[PDB]
Ligand binder design. Structure first.
Ligand SMILES: [Zn+2]
Ligand SMILES: [Zn+2]
Ligand SMILES: [Zn+2]
Ligand SMILES: [Zn+2]
Lengths: 220, 80, 83, 138, 294, 103, 173
């Protein structure tokens, strides 16, 4: 009773904290709030996954209904057993082939997503969309437009995007000062296919561990 | 902080933290927006919280300017 | 049955290994375990013991070791105060 | 073979069935014990990041499989990160979250003590007495 | 370039006394700076008592060092050096010898951008990094993290690291350290792979070799020496050398050296576990390190 | 035990003696009941040996064991090897309802 | 920072939006809703850039520019004193109210005329708590158009509390 009503306000607790935004309303009933704020707000600690205080047993997810059953890592998919055995609604293969897939072909191979120091998987999360996202931030760059989005845009080949004219009056993108586009800052004769422009960088090892040779263990 | 307003649910009040009017009360109050102030209830405490939110030596020629500030010695550049 | 066994193993592991936070443990009880284990390792490794000896600058190293031993008990602060 | 496993455990640990989460954790036990110290911790970091949310999962089989899995992860990661999770959840008000994580911290204190010594997030403002000898520099 | 308890002051040369040219306020995490080191005046690695290394970059005309990477875990760093631009050596008060590396995601950004845009200005970070900033501001405040590269445990407390481009004209540049309790040891980067493959297999042999002797001695008792016979002590190698944190890519040669002293019967008994080269070539590869690598 | 829950252990400081297991239980690591790569022979406190009870299988507690029990390499790294004296003091609900079930 | 986008064909997908706007500026985040009931895109998205400079830039260059599935793409960028007054005369026009309260204080909005019980009442919005105090002091219990009117604070219980002067002062600031 008295101890329950003795609690300091969470904002009174914020001042003790160097990173006050992590502390939350429920920290008021922390039996040792001044300590718990220091631990929770300590540098490298990773806050408890928030699926607690929910009674849903951490997975009720509607998204769980729409998750793909599985996908082979493409290196293993090269092994062709996908066609040999149909998992969807004998199969002998070469020892050298399989062994080389894991070792010769797949030594340097690593899953593309993984996760980071403090990455924690909440129920509603799905990594796959973020994998295509990270891969997409990689492939796609300004000045280039795929033929699909080009067809939807109804832009014929050899013709500049509609924002090149408004970009002539307004100016180059503030975010891309080094961006070049045919007809304006960049040679129109170099206009080719899906690329109407490219960023021209103005910036222009061994890491003590350079192996200088790569030799995998041989099965034979 | 909001008109001593009444809320019928804790999820809803937890949604009040990101809102137009709630941020208008904060920012117009002088307590700037977003995520540090989320747990606010009363107007008073976040004022001291916002108060919680908000020596170089350029060597003059007499060799006493080792205590002298950068901008001060630049002012003596404009004076010199 | 299973949880009930985990209670008994909680009593046994707590007996052997001394401090093990069960569910509710006071910060005074637990921090004492922290201090005791940290000092325990500082004096336990001849390495870190040699290190603290020099950085502290004591005349002998066993002064630092038995210092840590004494520093394990809470009353040793008031003991130093009474010197 | 560890890396080719992690995309499979991706759908395993994420799966809704406490059975699949259970046996997947049993995979992480042996895999983590025998692969510990190989340098795959970055993959082990992933595999754990999917496990932490399962700590609160009840039932005896699930709870012991997940405990053993996390203890195997303590050997492959080392306490420090595994600690960091345990710390940020170590006390907490919830009376439930607390009872759950102090199990993992009990097993961690059983296997490792000196190993956890450097990793206690303890500062002079954090605790009164602290230890005067940790700040000594020569 | 000096470090206060909290902050890093860069003093110039004044007359009648020396002047503060610039001051850099540390992130809140750093209480004190035990040791620090530079890379070609452009970069810094700053150590702590409690917390771990954090790398800074000097920005001219910004007159400030900007932290661009945090460290993963809490490590008490006594002495610290650079192998490279992107990697760092460090020891512990408790005897861990580790080496960290900035992630390629950070190396691309700093290679492709000027430091002046880090503190203020436009630097485009992938979606995940920002979500880690609002999600976990305490850990990811420095917006990157050191992936553990090498980790090791030497029971001494390392006083001085030195990176020597060559040890007695040897090609592979080594890093040699002197410990406080006294010791000097080296970490030699292994070129190619099958070097570390053969070394790794030999270390794996000598690791449980005591157990192999115990299982042979057990089988002969089934048809008709304790467990710690070959190690003389119960500690496993991976266990002892792991200790505080598991050794990552570092293979320990101090073990494989013990293979040299064992009798020919024992050695030939151990090497049979390999389809690879004979004991003689084993000893060849073992003794190769002191000869060729230094 | 790892599987049957009600089985209680000893957990005292192990002595020089080595625990025996019957041919029926042969091959199990007394903690995890694993058949793979055993390492170190079990050691029990003197309080679990003494007279006839020394001959019992430390696992099933009933039969008289010839063989020595070894810890696996996973328990030897998990340290449960050195935890204490493994033994099963209570026969357990499984074995009980088995005996009462048949007779 | 964040820009609203609309008049989008549900066949436009997330990768297509990303590839579209990366041509304009760097895109920090894209929230592109998905209807759970219909299992379809509801045809408007939100693109959060790295700053309001690139945001406003994309608003200027992008608006009424790109044609996707023959439909044009749209882009759009994403607390006061209140006095209750009772017993007003039927001859009192809202504009007459405006004239009456302008001398005391500037009105942030127009008065609201409503009938209680027959009983003509109005809400008057002042930009200042002090000017509201002026219209109260002078106009309380006064006879206008041969009818006695009452001027006080409107309920929220009623305005004019101690924290109300404090925060309304700030909203004035
Ligand atoms: Zn509010
Ligand atoms: Zn016993
Ligand atoms: Zn038996
Ligand atoms: Zn076992």
């Amino acid at each position: 009773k008295r101890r329950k009503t003795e609690k300091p306000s969470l904002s009174q607790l914020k001042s003790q904290v160097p990173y006050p935004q992590i502390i939350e309303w429920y920290d008021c009933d922390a039996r040792y709030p001044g300590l718990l704020a220091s631990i929770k707000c300590t540098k490298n600690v990773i806050p408890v996954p928030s699926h607690w205080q929910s009674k849903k047993e951490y997975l009720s997810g509607r998204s769980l209904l729409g998750k793909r059953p599985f996908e082979l890592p493409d290196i293993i998919k090269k092994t062709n057993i996908e066609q040999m055995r149909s998992t969807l609604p004998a199969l002998d293969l070469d020892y050298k082939k399989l062994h080389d897939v894991f070792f010769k072909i797949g030594a340097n191979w690593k899953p593309d997503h993984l996760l980071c120091f403090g990455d924690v998987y909440y129920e509603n999360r799905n990594l796959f969309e973020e994998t295509n996202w990270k891969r997409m931030v990689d492939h796609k760059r300004p000045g280039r437009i795929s033929q699909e989005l080009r067809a939807i845009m109804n832009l014929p080949e050899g013709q500049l995007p509609p924002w090149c004219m408004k970009m002539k009056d307004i100016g180059l993108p503030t975010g891309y000062p080094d961006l070049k586009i045919a007809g304006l800052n960049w040679d129109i004769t170099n206009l080719k296919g899906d690329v109407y422009g490219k960023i021209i960088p103005n910036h222009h090892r061994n890491y003590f561990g350079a192996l200088i040779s790569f030799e995998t263990p041989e099965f034979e | 902080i909001c008109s001593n307003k009444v809320y019928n649910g804790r999820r809803t009040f937890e949604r009040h933290f990101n809102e137009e009017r709630h941020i208008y009360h904060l920012r117009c109050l002088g307590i700037e927006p977003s995520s540090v102030f989320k747990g606010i209830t009363k107007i008073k405490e976040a004022q001291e919280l916002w108060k919680n939110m908000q020596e170089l030596e350029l060597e003059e020629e007499d060799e006493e300017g080792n205590v002298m500030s950068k901008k001060v010695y630049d002012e003596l550049k404009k004076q010199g | 049955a299973e949880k009930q066994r985990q209670l008994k193993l909680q009593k046994i592991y707590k007996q052997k290994y001394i401090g093990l936070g069960d569910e509710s443990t006071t910060r005074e009880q637990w921090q004492r375990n922290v201090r005791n284990d940290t000092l325990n390792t500082l004096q336990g490794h001849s390495a870190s013991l040699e290190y603290v000896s020099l950085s502290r600058g004591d005349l002998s190293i066993r002064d630092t070791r038995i210092h840590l031993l004494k520093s394990m008990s809470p009353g040793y602060k008031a003991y130093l105060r009474e010197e | 073979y560890i890396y080719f496993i992690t995309p499979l455990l991706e759908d395993a640990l994420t799966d809704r069935d406490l059975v699949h989460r259970q046996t997947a954790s049993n995979v992480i036990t042996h895999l983590a014990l025998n692969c510990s110290g190989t340098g795959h911790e970055d993959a082990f970091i992933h595999l754990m990041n999917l496990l932490i949310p399962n700590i609160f999962e009840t039932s005896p089989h699930a709870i012991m499989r997940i405990l053993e899995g996390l203890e195997a992860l303590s050997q492959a990661l080392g306490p420090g990160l595994f600690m960091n999770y345990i710390w940020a959840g170590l006390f907490h008000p919830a009376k439930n979250v607390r009872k759950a994580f102090w199990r993992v911290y009990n097993n961690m204190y059983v296997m490792y003590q000196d190993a956890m010594v450097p990793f206690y997030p303890v500062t002079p403002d954090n605790n009164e007495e602290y230890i005067e000898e940790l700040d000594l520099v020569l | 370039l000096t470090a206060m308890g909290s902050t890093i002051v860069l003093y110039g040369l004044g007359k009648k006394q020396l002047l503060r040219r610039s001051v850099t306020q540390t992130p809140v995490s750093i209480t004190k700076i035990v040791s620090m080191h530079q890379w070609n005046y452009e970069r810094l690695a700053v150590g702590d008592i409690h917390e771990s290394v954090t790398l800074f970059i000097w920005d001219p005309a910004g007159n400030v060092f900007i932290p661009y990477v945090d460290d993963s875990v809490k490590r008490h760093v006594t002495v610290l050096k650079f192998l490279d631009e992107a990697t760092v050596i460090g020891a512990d008060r408790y005897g861990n010898a580790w080496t960290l590396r900035s992630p390629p995601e950070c190396e691309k950004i700093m290679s492709n951008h000027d430091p002046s845009e880090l503190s203020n200005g436009a630097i485009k970070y992938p979606l995940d990094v920002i979500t880690l900033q609002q999600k976990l501001p305490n850990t990811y405040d420095c917006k990157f993290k050191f992936q553990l590269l090498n980790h090791f445990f030497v029971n001494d407390i390392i006083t001085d690291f030195h990176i020597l481009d060559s040890l007695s004209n040897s090609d592979r540049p080594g890093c040699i350290y002197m410990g406080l309790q006294g010791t000097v040891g080296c970490f030699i980067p292994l070129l190619s792979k099958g070097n570390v493959f053969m070394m790794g297999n030999i270390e794996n042999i000598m690791a449980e070799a005591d157990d192999t002797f115990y299982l042979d001695y057990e089988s002969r008792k089934k048809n008709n020496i304790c467990e710690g016979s070959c190690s003389i002590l119960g500690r496993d190698h991976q266990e002892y050398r792991s200790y505080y944190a598991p050794v990552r890519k570092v293979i320990d040669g101090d073990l494989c050296e013990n293979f040299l002293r064992l009798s020919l019967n024992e050695q030939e008994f151990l090497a049979k576990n390999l389809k690879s080269v004979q004991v003689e070539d084993i000893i060849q590869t073992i003794n190769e390190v002191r000869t060729n690598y230094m | 035990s790892r599987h049957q829950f009600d089985l209680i252990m000893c957990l005292k400081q192990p002595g020089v003696q080595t625990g025996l297991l019957c041919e029926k239980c042969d091959g199990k690591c007394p903690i995890c009941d694993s058949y793979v790569r055993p390492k170190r022979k079990v050691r029990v406190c003197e309080n679990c040996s003494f007279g006839k009870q020394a001959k019992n299988c430390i696992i099933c507690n009933l039969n008289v064991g010839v063989n020595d029990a070894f810890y696996c390499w996973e328990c030897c790294r998990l340290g449960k090897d050195k935890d204490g004296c493994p033994r099963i003091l209570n026969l357990g609900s499984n074995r009980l309802d088995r005996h009462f079930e048949k007779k | 920072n964040t820009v609203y986008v609309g008049n989008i064909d549900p066949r436009i997908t997330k990768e297509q939006l990303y590839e579209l706007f990366i041509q304009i500026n760097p895109v920090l985040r894209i929230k592109y809703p998905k209807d759970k009931v219909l299992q379809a895109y509801q045809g408007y998205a939100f693109i959060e850039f790295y700053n309001q400079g690139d945001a406003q830039y994309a608003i200027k260059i992008m608006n009424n520019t790109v044609r996707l599935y023959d439909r044009l793409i749209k882009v759009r960028q994403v607390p006061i004193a209140k006095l209750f007054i009772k017993n007003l005369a039927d001859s009192i026009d809202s504009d007459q109210l405006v004239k009456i309260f302008n001398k005391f204080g500037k009105l942030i909005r127009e008065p609201e005329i409503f009938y209680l019980s027959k009983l003509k009442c109005a809400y008057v919005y002042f930009e200042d708590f002090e000017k509201a105090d002026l219209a109260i002091k002078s106009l309380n219990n006064q006879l206008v158009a041969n009818n006695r009117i009452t001027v006080d604070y409107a309920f929220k219980n009623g305005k004019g509390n101690a924290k109300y002067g404090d925060d309304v002062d700030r909203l004035l600031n």
